[PDB]
Structures are given as structure tokens and as C-alpha cells.
């Protein structure tokens, strides 16, 4: 299995234990999810490095 060439929808999944306070504070402003895509870690943020299989 190579997560780099499986699909493109599974690259948007979450691998965080809990959402930060910034996410909840920004939800009240009706923002778009592309603005805070770097705040919450996703699968795409780990591609290439050895820990795509390791810790989710």
C-alpha cells in the first residue's frame, strides 16, 4: 500500500487528537475551510515522509 497513489479524497482526512481553540473561534466568523487548512493536520501534510503508516 502506497498512500501517495490511492485516491485524492482520503488526503483530506484528520490525524489530530483534538481540534485547537483557533478552529472553534474561527467557526463563529463563518470562514471557509481553506483558510485554516494549515492549523489542523491532515493526511496530505504527511505524504512523502516515513510516517504515513505510523501514527494517526
Amino acid at each position: 500500500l502506497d498512500p501517495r497513489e490511492v485516491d485524492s479524497e482520503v488526503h483530506n482526512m484528520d490525524i489530530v487528537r483534538y481540534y485547537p481553540l483557533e478552529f472553534y473561534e474561527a467557526t463563529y466568523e463563518l470562514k471557509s475551510p481553506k483558510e485554516l487548512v494549515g492549523v489542523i493536520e491532515r493526511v496530505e501534510d504527511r505524504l512523502g515522509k516515513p510516517e504515513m503508516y505510523y501514527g494517526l
Partner: protein, 110 residues
């Protein structure tokens, strides 16, 4: 590369697959079937799947190196160009070249 657990996992999986494949190959050799060998090859990455499905033969290494260098879409375009110029062998008329190139490119980008 991978740590000392993922590699062991994949190695055990390959060992079990080999263990099943040996029996399947041994049984099919006795000739009680349409063919004298198993009819499902095993791939490992995208280049192997593309080579086994649409061809042309030998495209696996070229896809590998082109993906390492440029990317996915650019590597598909360079593979199309190499097919058109005729690196992998003479096919025939322009229709054959067009069909082969479109099939291989749609398989790569997919």
C-alpha cells in the same frame, strides 16, 4: 526509509502471498485447466499495474524515473511524447500510435 515495524509487516504479507502462490502454481501445472500457469500477476506500484494492463512493454522504469523527476501529469505527457517518437518499438500506422498513447496516458493519470 520505513521504520522496523512497517517493513516487517509488509515482509510477512509477501511471505504469506508467496506461500499461497507456490501451491497455486503447483496445482495448475498438471494441465486440468485452460492454462498451465496462474493468470493473476502481482504488481507493486502504479508503473507495474500500467505495464501489466495497457503496456507497452518496458514502460515501467520510464514511468518510475519520470515520476521521480517531474511529477504525475508532466510524466504522463513525457511518456506520451516518448511513445509518439517511438522509443518502445515500432507499432504501425498513426492510428495505432494514437490509440496506444491515449490508453497509456489515461492509465497513468488514473
Amino acid at each position: 526509509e520505513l521504520p522496523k515495524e512497517m517493513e516487517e509487516y509488509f515482509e510477512m504479507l509477501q511471505r504469506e502471498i508467496d506461500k499461497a502462490y507456490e501451491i497455486a502454481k503447483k496445482a495448475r501445472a498438471q494441465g486440468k485447466d485452460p492454462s498451465l500457469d496462474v493468470e493473476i500477476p502481482q504488481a507493486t506500484d502504479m508503473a507495474g499495474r500500467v505495464e501489466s494492463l495497457v503496456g507497452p512493454p518496458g514502460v515501467a522504469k520510464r514511468i518510475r524515473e519520470l515520476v521521480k523527476e517531474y511529477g504525475k501529469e508532466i510524466a504522463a505527457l513525457k511518456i506520451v511524447d516518448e511513445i509518439i517518437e517511438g522509443k518502445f518499438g515500432d507499432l504501425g500506422s498513426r492510428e495505432k500510435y494514437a490509440e496506444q498513447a491515449v490508453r497509456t496516458a489515461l492509465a497513468i493519470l488514473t
